[PDB]
Amino acid sequence: EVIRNLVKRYVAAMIRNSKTTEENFKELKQDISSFRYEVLDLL
Amino acid sequence: RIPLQIVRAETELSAEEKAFLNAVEKGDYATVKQALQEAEIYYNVNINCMDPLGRSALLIAIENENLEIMELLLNHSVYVGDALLYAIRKEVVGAVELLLSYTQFSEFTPDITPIMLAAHTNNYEIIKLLVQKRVTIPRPHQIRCNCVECVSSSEVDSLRHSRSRLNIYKALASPSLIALSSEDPILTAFRLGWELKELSKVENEFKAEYEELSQQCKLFAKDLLDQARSSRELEIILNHRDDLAKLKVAIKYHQKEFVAQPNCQQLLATLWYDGFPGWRRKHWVVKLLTCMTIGFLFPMLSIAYLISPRSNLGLFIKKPFIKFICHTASYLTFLFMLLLASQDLHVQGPPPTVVEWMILPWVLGFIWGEIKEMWDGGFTEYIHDWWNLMDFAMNSLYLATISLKIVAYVKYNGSRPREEWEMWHPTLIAEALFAISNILSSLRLISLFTANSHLGPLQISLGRMLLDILKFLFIYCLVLLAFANGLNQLYFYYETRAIDEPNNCKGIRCEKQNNAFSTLFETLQSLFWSVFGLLNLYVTNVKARHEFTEFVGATMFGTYNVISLVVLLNMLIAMMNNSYQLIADHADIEWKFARTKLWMSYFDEGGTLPPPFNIISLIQNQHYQEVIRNLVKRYVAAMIRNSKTTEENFKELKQDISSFRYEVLDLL
Amino acid sequence: GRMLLDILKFLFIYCLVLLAFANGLNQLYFYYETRAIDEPNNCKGIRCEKQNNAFSTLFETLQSLFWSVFGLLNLYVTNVKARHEFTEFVGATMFGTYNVISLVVLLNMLIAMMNNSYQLIADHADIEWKFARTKLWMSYFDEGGTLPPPFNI
Amino acid sequence: RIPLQIVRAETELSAEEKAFLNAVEKGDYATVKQALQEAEIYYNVNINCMDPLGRSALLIAIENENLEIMELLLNHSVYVGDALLYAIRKEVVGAVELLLSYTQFSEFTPDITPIMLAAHTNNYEIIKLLVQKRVTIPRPHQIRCNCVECVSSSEVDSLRHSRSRLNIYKALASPSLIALSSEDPILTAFRLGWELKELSKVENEFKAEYEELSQQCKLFAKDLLDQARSSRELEIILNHRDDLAKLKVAIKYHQKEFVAQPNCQQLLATLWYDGFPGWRRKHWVVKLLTCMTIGFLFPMLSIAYLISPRSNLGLFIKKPFIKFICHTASYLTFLFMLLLASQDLHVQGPPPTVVEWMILPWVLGFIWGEIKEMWDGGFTEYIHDWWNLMDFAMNSLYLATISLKIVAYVKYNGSRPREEWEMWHPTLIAEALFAISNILSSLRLISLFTANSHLGPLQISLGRMLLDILKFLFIYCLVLLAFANGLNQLYFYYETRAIDEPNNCKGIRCEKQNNAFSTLFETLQSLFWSVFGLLNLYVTNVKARHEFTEFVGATMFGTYNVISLVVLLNMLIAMMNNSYQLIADHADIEWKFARTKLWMSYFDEGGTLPPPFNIISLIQNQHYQEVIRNLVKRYVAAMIRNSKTTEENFKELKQDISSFRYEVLDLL
Amino acid sequence: NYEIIKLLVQKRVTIPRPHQIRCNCVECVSSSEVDSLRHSRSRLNIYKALA
Ligand SMILES: CC(C)CCC[C@@H](C)[C@H]1CC[C@H]2[C@@H]3CC=C4C[C@@H](OC(=O)CCC(=O)O)CC[C@]4(C)[C@H]3CC[C@]12C
Ligand SMILES: CC(C)CCC[C@@H](C)[C@H]1CC[C@H]2[C@@H]3CC=C4C[C@@H](OC(=O)CCC(=O)O)CC[C@]4(C)[C@H]3CC[C@]12C
Ligand SMILES: Cn1c(=O)n(CCCO)c(=O)c2c1nc(Oc1cccc(Cl)c1)n2Cc1ccc(Cl)cc1
Ligand SMILES: Cn1c(=O)n(CCCO)c(=O)c2c1nc(Oc1cccc(Cl)c1)n2Cc1ccc(Cl)cc1
Ligand SMILES: Cn1c(=O)n(CCCO)c(=O)c2c1nc(Oc1cccc(Cl)c1)n2Cc1ccc(Cl)cc1
Ligand SMILES: [Ca+2]
Ligand SMILES: [Ca+2]
Ligand SMILES: [Zn+2]
Ligand SMILES: [Zn+2]
Ligand SMILES: [Zn+2]
After folding, report:
1. Chains contacting chain A through 3 or more C-beta pairs under 8 A
2. Smallest-distance ligand from the CA of B523
3. Nearest ligand to residue D326 Cα
4. Best label site of B140, D30, D110, D617, fewest CB within 10 Å?
C-alpha cells in the first residue's frame, strides 16, 4: 500500500514536471487551418 | 519472455465516463452540458470519475483554463475538494475567484493551506486575493525550542514536522507576502533571512532549501533598495530607526548585497570624503600627494583637535577619510620607529633607550584604545572582529616585554657578556617577545588592504582560502605525527651526546645535522624542515653498521617526503584552485561589505585621536511608511514586468482554439 | 603580459610579509653580529661557503629571506655561538613561519590567481594579439626609421 | 541639447502606400485585392514601394508565410527580383514552388545563387526542388592555385574573391547537398573535410569558418555510419574500394569520429581477438594469466611460424592480439637483457660478452625491421609516425656503438687501467652511446600505453600538453640565454685554473662548486641547475674584495631565479591546466583513433615475426550503392526528426489568425 | 509515456528476457557471430525498455 501511494505520487509529480518544440507550432497551425477550412466550407 | 501487466490495479472508466472526460478535455461545451443534464436523469455517468492520470473533470477544466466549463461543472455541484490548491498552483486568476465564490489521492501534503500555497507560488494577485479575507499562517516556534508540543511532534512524526516547518518558512519568505501584510518589509526580510540561515545551520538536512530561502530574502531586500529613485528616499530608508541606523542593522544581519548596493555605496562615499568634494575626479598624482601631505601633518591635526576642536584644524580630523589617514600615518611612524629600534649590549637589564622611550607611548595608546573599545562597543562586537585577536596578542606580548625589562632592570646591575648569560635570562626572553611583537605589529597592516580597490578583493580571496588551508592542516598534522612517531621509535636508540658531535652542536640546526630523529620534538622539527628541503639525507645514517635499520629509516623518510610533497601539496593546490574559482564571483560584494565596515568604524566620535594622542519619531515613521509604499509598488510592477518578459501554454492555446471551433460549429 | 598584473598584485602582500619577518629576525639576531675576521675564511654574509650573519643586519636579513624562497639559505644560519637555545629556537620558529607563509600559503595562492586570470584571458587572446600585431605592422609603414642601426646615423 | 534628425534620408511612403502595406502585413486579402485592382485604374499606389525596413509587399507576404496574398501579388506582376532568395532563406516550401513557377538594396551578396543559398540553409526539401532542375555550382580552384584568373580576382577584389570562395565551400559542405548529387557521400565528406582543413590552415583569416565546415563534414560522415543497422551493412561500407579499405581511407584523412564509431570499434575488436572468442567477458586474473602464458611462449610461436606456417601453432601468431603479445614479450626480453648487461673492465676494446652476443641479434632485427618498413610502406608513411624518429635515433646510436666497439677491438690490445685512458677513448664513447641507447630503448615503451584503456587517453593528454611545454620552451630559452650572457660578461674576469681549486676540480660538478659563470657553456649549465636548486649560492662569490661586483652578480642570479621559478614555472602550470581542461573532452576519441592505428598495424602479413626472428568490382559497387541509399534515407529522416523535435513562428501564427478573422468578417 | 505504456499493458504484451551478462548459450553466441550489430542493438533496446 505504501508503494502504491508512492507510485501514484511519483507519476503525478513527474507528469506535472514534464508539463511545467517546432511540432507544437505545426500542430497549432494545423488546428487553425482545419478550423478555417471548416468555417469556409460551412459559410 | 517477461509478462507485463498491472501490478497495482485500479477502477477503469466506463465507455461513457471516457467520452465525457474526452469532451471535457477537448473543451466542447455543448456535449459536456448535455452529459451533465443527462446524468441527473439517467445516473449513467459519474461526474466525479477520475482519469488514468487521477484528474477529475474539474481538474481537467482547471488545467485547461476553461472558465466556462469549470463554472458549468461548479453549477452542477461536482466534488471540489482540493481543487482550490490546483487552481492556485496553476497560477490562473479565474479559477480562484470562481472557486473562492463557490482520503483521496492529492498532489499536496495535508499541511498545505490555500494561503501557504499561494505564498509558495509568489503570485501577487492570488496572494492579495487570499489576504483580502481573514487568513492566517501558523507561527513557527523557536529554532531551538524545547516545548512539549515540538518534541511530541518530532517524536511522533519527524518527517511530517520537518515538512510542515519548511512549508511554513517557504510561505513566510515569499517576497510578495512580505510586500503585503508587513509593517517594515526591509526589517522583516533581514530578520527572516537571518533566521533562515540559522535554521540552515541547525538543520543538517534541508540545508540547501533554507540557504536558498535566506538568499531569496536577501535579494528581496536588495531589490526593494534598488527601487529607490532619489537621494531623499535613500537617506530616509537608511536612517530609519525601528545616523544610518538601518544600514547598521543591515550590517548586523550580514546583508552583504544590501550594503553593496551602488546607491548605498555612493552615499557612503559622499560621507567618506567629507572634506574633499571632488575626490572622485582627480589624478593619481594629486591623490597621492594629498594623502602624503595629510599623513605627514597628523601630529598637527591631533594637537589641534586636543587644543581647540572647533577650528579649521580642530574638526578637520573628525572627517572620516582624514581620520583614517591620520591613524594610518601614526601606525606607519610606529612601524618606522620599530625598524629604527634595531640600529652597548652587555648590560644586564639596561635602561630603555630614546627609541624605546618614544615607542612606549604608542604601546600605551594601543592598550588604552583596545580597552576603550572593549568598554564602549561591548563584548560580542569586540570578539566578532577577529582582528582584535592579533591586537590582544600584540598588547599581551608588549606588556610581557615591559614586565621583563623592568624585572631585568631591578634584578641585575652588573655588565656581564651575553656569551655566559643564562638560557632563560630575562633580557633574552624580553627581546624574543619584542621581536615577535614587531612581527605581529608589521603583519597587522594586512587589515588596511580593505581600503584599497585593487588590494581589497584580493585580501578577501586569500582570507577565504585560509579556510581550505586550515582544513588541509588537520590531515597534514595527522600524517606528520604518524611518521614522527615511527621515525622516533626507530631512531631513539642511537641518540648521541652533544660532546661526541664534531663542534659540540647537537640537533638539526648545526652545520653538520645530527640526531634528527633522536627525540620526538626533534623528529617533529626535522619532518617540518624536510618539507622545505633543509633536512639533509645523511641524517638517516647511524654510526653502527645497521644497514637494515638505516634503510628502513630512509624509507620512512622517503615515504613521508612522497606523501607530504607529491600527494598532499598538490591536493592542497587543487583545493585552493577550486575554492578561489568558487569565491571569485562574489569577491566584489564581500570586499564592499568589508570596506563599508571599515568606513563606518571611522564615523564614530570615539577613537578620533590615534595613538599616542589618545592617552593625553512619528513623522519619521510616516515618511518611512510612504517611502516603503512607493518602493513596494515599484518592486511589484518591476517583478511582474520581469516575469512577463511552457507546454501548458500550448495546451491552453489548443483548448481555446478547440472551444472556439466547437462553438462556431454548433452555431452554424 | 596580462598575468604579470596578477604577479604585481601579489608582490605587495609578499613584500609586506617579507618586511615584517625581516624586521622580527633582525631585531632578534642583531645582538650576535660577528666580525669578518672571526669567520673561518674571512668571509661574512650568506654568499660564503659556510653561511653566517644571515640576520645580523636588515639588508642581509632581507637578502636571506629572499634566498630562502629558493632554498639556498641553510638552516644552521639560525644558530648562534652562545648557548641561548631559547633565542635560537625562537629565531628558527620565525624562519619556519616565514617559510610556511611564503611557500605553502602565498605561492599556492599565486598559482591559483594565475590559473583564474589565464582562464579569464584565454578567450580574448586572439583579438588582443591581432591588435598588438597590427600596431607592430603599422610601426613599419612609416618612412622614418627605415634604416636600422647603425645605418640610421 | 543634441538635435536628432535623419542624416541619411530616404523617400517616405504616401498615406495610401502605408495603408496598403499595413493591409498586406495584417493579411487582409480583400483590402489588398481592392488596392491592387484600384492601382491598375487610378495608378495612385506604387505596388513596389518599400517600407521603413526596406521590405516590399512581396517580401512582407513571404515573411508572413501568406501564400494567398503572395500569389495574388504575383498574379498582379509585382517586382520579384531576389524574392526567391528570401523565400529560400525563410525555409518555406510554398514560397519557392510558387516563385519557381512564376541596383536595389539586398540582404544577399551578388555571388549568392538560389542553389547556393539553399545549400547554405541545408534544407533537404528546397535543395531537392532546386536539384530537380539543371543547376550547377562553380568549381573552386586549387587551394594553392596560381592561374591568371585567381590572381586577377585576388588583386582586383580580395574581399569579394574570399567571400565567393567561402560561400562556394559552404554550399558544397552541405550535408543535404552531399546526401543528394554525390556518388559516394562518405568519400566526398572525407575529402571535402580534408580540403576544408587545408584551407583553414592556408587562410589565416576565416580560419574558424573553414574549421567548422570541416567539422560539419566529419560529423556528417560519422552520422551516415551511425545509420547502419546490421553488421553486413557495416562490413560492406568499411570494405568498399573506390580488407577494411574505406576504414584505411578514413584513417588517412584523420576522420577520428568516424573511426571511433562504436560499431566500427566493435568490428575492429572482433578482428583484434581472432583467437579468443570470449575475451570480452573474462576476469582480470584470467586475462593476465593468458597474456603471461602467451608472452612466455613467444619464441615457440615464432619458431613454429618459421618452420611450418600451416599448423595450430604456425598460424597462431598471425592473429593480431597474439602477434602484439609476442612482439611486446620480445621487446621486454630485450630490455631485460639490457638491464642484465650491467651486472674485467681494464681491457681496451674487449670482445663482446655473452649478454652482448645475445643483444646483437635483437639490434640487427630492429634495424632490419625499420628498413623493411621503410621499403614497404613508403617514405611519407614512415615519417608520419613520429615514433620512427626515436627508432632511427636508437638504431643510429646502436650502430655507432658497434662501430666504436670494433674500432677499439682492432686498435687496442693492451690492458691499461681506465684511470689513465684518454678522455676521447673509443671504449668510453661507445659505452656512453650504449647507455643513451638503453635510455631511449626503455623509453620506447611509452607507445604501448595506447593498447591500454586506462593508460591510453592519459598518454594522449600528456602528448598534447607537450605542445604547450614546447611553446614555453622558447621563452624560457630566451630568458636563460639573456641572463647567461649577463652573468658571463660579469664573471669571466675572475676565471681560475683547476690547479688553484682545493681538489684540482673545476666547475659546478665538484664538491665545492667554483667557476660557475666563468665561461658561457658553464654559465648555461649553472643557470640550468639552479632551476632544480643544485647550484649553491657561494658560486656568486669571488676571491677579490669586489663586493659591488659580487652583489650585482648575486642580483642577476636572484632575478633569474625569480623569473624562471616564480613567474615562468607558474605560468607553465597555468598553461598546462588550461590545455588539459581543453583536451579532456576529446581524449576518448583521440585515444580510440590511436588504438585503431595500433591494431591495424598488426593486421598486415609483413612484420609478423618479432626480432630477432625477423632476420632468420561491379557487384561490390552495387552493394555499396544500395547500402548508401539506405543510409542516406535513414539519415535524412533522422535529421528531419531531430530538427522538428522563434519570434517568426508567433508572427506566422498571428498572421494566420488575422487572415482567418478577416475572411470570416468579410463572409459574415 | 505513462498513458501509452498503460494502454499497451492493458492488453497482453510481453518483452523478451535478456540473457545473462556473461551468458554462453548456443543462441547468444550464434546471434553474436551471425550479426553482432543487430544483437547488440536488440539487447540495448530491451534494456532501454525495461529501465
Ligand atoms: C609594501 C612594502 C614595501 C611594505 C610597505 C609598508 C607600508 C608603507 C605600506 C604597506 C601597505 C600600505 C597601505 C595599504 C593600504 C592603503 C590603502 C589606501 O587607501 C586608498 O587606496 C585610497 C582610497 C581610499 O582608501 O579612500 C591608503 C594607503 C594605504 C593605507 C597603504 C599605505 C602604505 C602601506 C601601509
Ligand atoms: C612500470 C615499471 C615497473 C616498468 C615496467 C616495464 C614493463 C614491465 C611494463 C611497463 C609498461 C607495460 C606495458 C603497458 C601496456 C600494455 C598494454 C596491455 O594491453 C592491454 O591492456 C590488454 C587489452 C589489450 O591491449 O588488448 C598489455 C600489457 C602492456 C604491453 C604492458 C606490459 C608491461 C610493461 C611493458
Ligand atoms: C617511497 N620510496 C622511498 O622511500 N625510497 C627511499 C628508500 C631508501 O633509499 C625510494 O628509494 C623509492 C620510493 N619509491 C620509489 O619508487 C617506487 C614507485 C612505486 C612502487 C615502489 Cl615499490 C617504488 N623509490 C625508488 C626505488 C624504486 C625501486 C627499488 Cl627496488 C628501490 C628504490
Ligand atoms: C611554523 N613551524 C616552525 O616554525 N617550526 C620550526 C621550529 C624550530 O625548529 C616547526 O618545527 C613546525 C612549525 N609548524 C609545525 O607543525 C605544526 C602544524 C600546526 C600547528 C603547530 Cl603548533 C605546529 N612544525 C613542526 C612541529 C609540530 C609540533 C611540535 Cl611540539 C614542534 C614542531
Ligand atoms: C630580485 N632580487 C634579488 O636578486 N635579490 C638578491 C640580491 C643579492 O643578495 C634579493 O635579495 C631580492 C630581490 N627581490 C627582493 O624583494 C623585492 C621585491 C620587490 C621590489 C624590490 Cl626592489 C625587492 N629581494 C629581497 C630584498 C628586498 C629589499 C632590499 Cl633593500 C634588498 C633585498
Ligand atoms: Ca581593533
Ligand atoms: Ca616503428
Ligand atoms: Zn515549541
Ligand atoms: Zn585558379
Ligand atoms: Zn544466452
Report:
1. B, D, E
2. 4
3. 2
4. D617
